[PDB]
């Protein structure tokens, strides 16, 4: 009775605390599954072993200007952001 009903109360307190952080932690974890399913040029899982043999095929034989342009884009909203802060 006492020790089980104390566990209920401590669970209730922890659920109450972690909930506003919980959605953030879930969508932070979302990055890793997107990076494990968007990285590999990936076919069906059962068939994947056949595509693994394509990698065997590999071992059967084996400053940029738009970058500076998008950094120059970033600088303008930086200036507008600084204007907003100094306006506050």
């Amino acid at each position: 009775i006492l020790l089980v009903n104390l566990l209920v109360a401590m669970f209730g307190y922890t659920v109450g605390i972690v909930q506003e952080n919980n959605d953030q932690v879930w969508k932070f974890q979302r990055y890793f599954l997107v990076q494990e399913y968007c990285n590999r040029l990936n076919i069906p899982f059962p068939f994947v072993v056949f595509a693994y043999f394509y990698m065997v095929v590999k071992k059967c034989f084996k400053f940029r200007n738009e970058d500076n342009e998008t950094l120059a884009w970033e600088g303008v909203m930086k200036e507008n952001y600084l204007v907003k802060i100094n306006t506050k």
Binding site: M10, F28, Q29, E36, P44, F45, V49, L71, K78
Partner: protein, 478 residues
């Protein structure tokens, strides 16, 4: 200072000495005076002789003066010669800061701190503003950092790298004052990175998602999104711009404003890819491949495969398990080999950090127990080995089945609760600690009062541990 300047200026010989007036107004904090009657006539600005006064404004913490010097014209990357950086890190670099850097490299080592340890090892014996920014950011200078940060190209990358460095140095236990300063400055730069990127995103989506993926020709050798991951900067990834980016990469070619039942219904009826029930915004074989490439459906196919694997496992183990493997065990070993190939693929493409995750550890461990059950299984005409093979497969089935909880963390509804589930461990362990103490005390007292000199160990532990354990589900010892 104003009295000294009135004396120095009215000697009618050093009226022409703008350098001596400037150095006098620099050694004091007379900013308004140096603004109003040195840089105002527009009569003599050479813009190259400002180097000694720049070095002095750096090493004596005059950030408003370096702001005025940049505003009137001085290029940092012209100025910041490697001799300047070796003078800053060799002579003007503090010795308590370097000891905290040693302690943080020995006790809390990291990828970015390995990188900054190597560059601070370089200059005590090419992206210059980032090195000056690291110098100012480590010293906890907090206002020279802002002045140099406003002059950078990769501004969001700079803010995220600085936030990671300062969060690592805020863990060093000696000198908790310096830990408190570095924690506050870390929070200030991570707030700055978030608020700048949300303005970049709220003006424009395509160019902000252009920003997110670049590596700045080895900043720390990494990426803006990677640096937010490494610092566990989960307020930068929880924001709606990065979440929009991620969900657009998760649905792939399918437009996100379609309902989900249409997607899975088109998944089960395979040649229904060629019809107007799924919108493919973000000739007919392109609709085919645009469906079957997306992350959503290769994931959903993979979980259907895995459930069919668990049903075949269960059928084999419970209803069809003989002295020689019949055909469903051979199909089962083929499917387990497929899972083995996926795990060795993931290990070959991660390296060492693959063994950091606990799921991959128990994953490899389950494959080990499966092949051990095979080598116990093939010794036919021996009943003990064949029974032992089946027992090994049953415990391995427990592991394979409980992996399904980890699979369903991607869901929009179940997912956050499964993530919440691991925050309960300290409550469970406090419960089990108190319960084990009570259980041992009551069990030893009851076994001592009732009986006399039990010699059998199994009947010691059935009475002392097992029956007081069963009292937790309401059994009441007999």
């Amino acid at each position: 200072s104003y009295a000294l300047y009135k004396a120095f200026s009215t000697n009618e010989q050093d009226k022409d000495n703008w350098n001596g007036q400037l150095k006098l107004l620099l050694e004091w904090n007379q900013l308004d005076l140096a603004s109003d009657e040195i840089f105002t006539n527009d009569r003599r600005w050479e813009s190259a002789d400002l180097q000694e006064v720049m070095f002095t404004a750096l090493i004596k913490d005059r950030p408003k003066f370096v702001r005025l010097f940049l505003e009137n014209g001085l290029n940092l990357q012209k100025f910041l010669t490697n001799e300047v950086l070796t003078e800053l890190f060799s002579t003007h670099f503090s010795t308590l800061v370097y000891r905290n850097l040693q302690i943080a490299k020995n006790s809390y080592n990291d990828a970015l701190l390995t990188f900054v340890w190597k560059l601070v090892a370089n200059f005590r014996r090419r992206h210059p503003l980032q090195a000056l920014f690291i110098w100012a950011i480590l010293q906890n200078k907090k206002e020279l950092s802002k002045v140099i940060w406003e002059q950078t190209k990769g501004c969001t990358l700079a803010a995220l790298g600085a936030s990671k460095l300062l969060k690592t140095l805020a863990k060093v236990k000696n000198d908790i004052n310096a830990a408190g300063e570095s924690e506050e400055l870390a929070n200030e730069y991570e707030t700055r990175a978030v608020e700048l990127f949300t303005e970049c995103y709220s003006n424009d989506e395509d160019l902000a998602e252009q920003l997110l993926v670049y590596s700045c020709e080895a900043w720390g050798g990494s990426n803006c999104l990677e640096l937010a991951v490494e610092a566990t900067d989960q307020h930068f990834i929880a924001q709606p711009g990065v979440q929009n980016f991620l969900s657009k990469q998760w649905y792939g070619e399918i437009s996100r404003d379609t309902k989900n039942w249409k997607i899975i219904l088109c998944l089960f009826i395979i040649p229904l890819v060629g019809c107007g029930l799924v919108s493919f915004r973000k000739k007919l074989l392109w609709y085919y491949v645009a469906f079957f490439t997306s992350p959503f459906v290769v994931f959903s196919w993979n979980v259907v495969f895995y459930i069919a694997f668990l049903l075949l496992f269960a059928y084999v183990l419970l209803m069809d398990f003989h002295s020689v493997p019949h055909t469903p065990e051979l199909i089962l070993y083929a499917l387990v080999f497929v899972l083995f190939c996926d795990e060795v693929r993931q290990w070959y493409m991660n390296g060492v950090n693959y063994f950091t995750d606990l799921w991959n550890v128990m994953d490899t461990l389950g494959l080990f127990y499966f092949i051990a059950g095979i080598v116990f299984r093939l010794h036919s005409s021996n009943k003990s080995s064949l029974y032992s093979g089946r027992v090994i497969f049953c415990l391995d089935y427990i592991i394979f089945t409980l992996r399904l909880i980890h699979i369903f963390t991607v869901s929009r509804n179940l997912g956050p609760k499964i993530i919440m589930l691991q925050r309960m461990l300290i409550d469970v362990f406090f419960f089990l600690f108190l319960f084990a103490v009570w259980m041992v005390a009551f069990g030893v007292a009851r076994q001592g009062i009732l009986r006399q000199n039990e010699q059998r160990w199994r009947w010691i532990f059935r009475s002392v541990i097992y029956e007081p354990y069963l009292a937790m589900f309401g059994q009441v010892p007999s």
